[PDB]
Amino acid sequence: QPVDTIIYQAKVFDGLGNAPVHMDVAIKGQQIVALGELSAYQATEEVNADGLCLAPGFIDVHTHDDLEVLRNPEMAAKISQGVTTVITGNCGISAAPAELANDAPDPMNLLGEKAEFKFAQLRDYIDAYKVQKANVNVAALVGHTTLRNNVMADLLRPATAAEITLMQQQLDLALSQGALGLSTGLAYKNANQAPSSEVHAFGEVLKKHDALYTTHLRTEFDAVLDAMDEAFAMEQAFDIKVIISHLKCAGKNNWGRAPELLAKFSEQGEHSKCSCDAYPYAASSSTLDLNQVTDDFDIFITWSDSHPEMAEQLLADIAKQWGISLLDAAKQLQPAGAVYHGLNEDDVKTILAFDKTMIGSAGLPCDPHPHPRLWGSFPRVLGHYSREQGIFSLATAIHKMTGLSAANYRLANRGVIKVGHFADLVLFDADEIIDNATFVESALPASGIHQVWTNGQTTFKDKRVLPAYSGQFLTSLG
Ligand SMILES: CC(=O)N[C@@H](C(=O)O)[C@@H](O)[C@H](O)[C@H](O)CO
Ligand SMILES: [Zn+2]
């Protein structure tokens, strides 16, 4: 009869894009137990949300937090943005199922150091998660590149049919053990020689488990539209849910092509369930890639193992100091991290406004000077693009990081403020919410978020990240 907590008089967004409704929200244990008029109800704790907004906890659909959640269960970078659930294992790289013969192949170093990959089966990863749990829920995809590395010593080639068969079985086992689906990162060196038929070889296993396919496209530059055909073909052949990761048209050649990306979804054929996600910035981030070096836009070096004295500098400035070309400078800087200001802001706005588009940070948790998307993505959508820019309403912005995302990833009883769903919740000031992380100060926490609950326990409150550790591993339904 009594409940743990009642949030009073918040402006409540249900997560479905519907208009907010002023009402009260009752939490008991892990669940939203009552909605609406709750002065009758008996609550241990009472939260005065007057002048504030309540929304479902934010679902970061594009993370590389596979190992971060284990090293850093508090997950301040995500929790301080209001993120209550992370989707791990993106762009073909995951922490499990993985056995490392030698070093971790590029770009698996984005996840952690070689010694951290102790999860040969997915269940070992889940068990590792369950030791402490974390402030966020975890739903895990399996990385295609990671699977290739399990069965290939030389990755600069297609897998053999027999290697494909091994990987199928590894994926199938991972899917049975809880994984949500498969991800690829076909633009990366160690996956790029994987033909489309190799990716196709996973479709029957995915369909069997009613699992997801997500893809960092084979290219995001001139031939991005050809690369999207590959993703759609997965959906056409197998009728599975497909999500194109951090949708963009990168490169000076391609600025203004966002309408073409949108119209490309008209070529899906029979089905039309393909989705996508983006981060709210006109700059990408990854390791320094010689193929992306250009003087067409700013490229900012975030770290260099060869030349750490040149970290946090523009490639053009490093090149000038060094008396050599940008490409030659980049070569001497490798291995290195970079922020590539390769995208056009109007393209970003259009891709963000696209109703298929979920918000994902693509935060890189191992970068010593991260792209600020690691710390600002979700409040930037809410404060910058919604409130300030007016690209979309607050209900729309919230929908694209809660209900749309729970639906597309089939996260049961999450992403929506509804009775009987889990109490992942964020309490924030619609007028104050904003990202503070800049390209210079990229770990500055966002403003305007007052309180976060993961599964009914408070993981953030009044600028403090709290180690409730109430997240769960969200195992796939099958
Ligand atoms: C880890 C990761 O996948 N990062 C991508 C991103 O930040 O969007 C990046 O690799 C981009 O694909 C390229 O820089 C071209 O834009
Ligand atoms: Zn990617």
Q: Helix %, strand %, coil % for the chain, to 5?
A: 30, 25, 45
**Contact present, 142 and 95 (Cβ < 8 Å):** no
Gap between the Cα atoms of 410 and 404, Å rounded: 10
Give CA separation, 48 vs 25, 42, 77, 255, in Å.
Answer: 11, 15, 26, 46
**Contact present, 57 and 426 (Cβ < 8 Å):** yes
**What are the tokens at 305?**
């193992």
**Contact present, 359 and 344 (Cβ < 8 Å):** no
Gap between the Cα atoms of 242 and 434, Å rounded: 31
Strands 275-278 and 357-359: parallel
- Taking CA atoms only, the protein residue closest to ligand 1 atom 2 is 286
Which are the contacts of 464, defined by CB distance < 8 A and separation ≥ 6? none
CA of 460 to the centre of ligand 2 (A): 28
Among all bound ligands, the one having the nearest atom to the CA of 302 is: 1
CB atoms within 10 A of CB 163: 18
Q: Give the distance, in angstroms, between the CA of residue 348 and the centroid of all CA atoms in the same chain.
A: 16
Gap between the Cα atoms of 391 and 275, Å rounded: 20
**What are the tokens at 182?**
């498969």
Gap between the Cα atoms of 16 and 405, Å rounded: 10
* Rg of the chain (C-alpha set): 22
CA of 285 to the centre of ligand 1 (A): 5
* Start-end of H helices in 254-325: 258-264, 315-322
DSSP-derived secondary structure for 348-397: HHHHHHSTTEEE-----TT-SS--THHHHHHHIIIIIIIIIT-SS-HHHH
Q: Best of 190, 219, 284 to mutate for ligand 1, by most ligand atoms within 8 A of CB?
A: 284
> For residue 187, which atom of ligand 1 is closest to its CA?
12
Q: Using what technique was this structure determined?
A: X-ray
Length of the chain: 478
The three-class DSSP label of residue 285 is strand
The three-class DSSP label of residue 325 is coil
Resolution (A): 2.3
Gap between the Cα atoms of 80 and 459, Å rounded: 9
> For residue 250, which atom of ligand 1 is closest to its CA?
16
Domains of the chain: 57-281+343-409 (3.20.20.140), 283-342 (3.30.1490.130)
Among all bound ligands, the one having the nearest atom to the CA of 351 is: 1
CA of 119 to the centre of ligand 1 (A): 26
**What are the tokens at 78?**
């995500």
Q: Which H or E run contains 126?
A: helix 122-132
